[PDB]
C-alpha cells in the first residue's frame, strides 16, 4: 500500500531531486543522453516540475499535470 503518485510527486519533486525520465515521458531526447539524469530546480507548478539535465537543457515535465508522471528518481538518489 503506498501513497498515490500525486503524493509521491509532492514529496519528492523538490529542488535538488535527481531524476531520469519515467513512465509517461513523451519528450523525445530532451534528457540529453541515453538514460540521462537531471536535477529538479524548483517547486511544482500546476503539476509540472522544472529540471535541468546534466546534458545541459532546462525544461518542465509533468508530475501530476494531465494525470501524468514523466520522471523517476535517479538510481542512487534516496532521500
Curated annotation (Swiss-Prot):
Lineage: Eukaryota, Metazoa, Chordata, Craniata, Vertebrata
Included stretch of the parent chain: 1271 to 1340 of 2610
Protein name listed in UniProt: E3 ubiquitin-protein ligase HECTD1
Function: E3 ubiquitin-protein ligase which accepts ubiquitin from an E2 ubiquitin-conjugating enzyme in the form of a thioester and then directly transfers the ubiquitin to targeted substrates. Mediates 'Lys-63'-linked polyubiquitination of HSP90AA1 which leads to its intracellular localization and reduced secretion. Negatively regulating HSP90AA1 secretion in cranial mesenchyme cells may impair their emigration and may be essential for the correct development of the cranial neural folds and neural tube closure.
Description of how the protein assembles with itself and partners: Interacts with IGSF1.
Domain MIB/HERC2 intervals: 10-77
Family: Belongs to the UPL family. K-HECT subfamily.
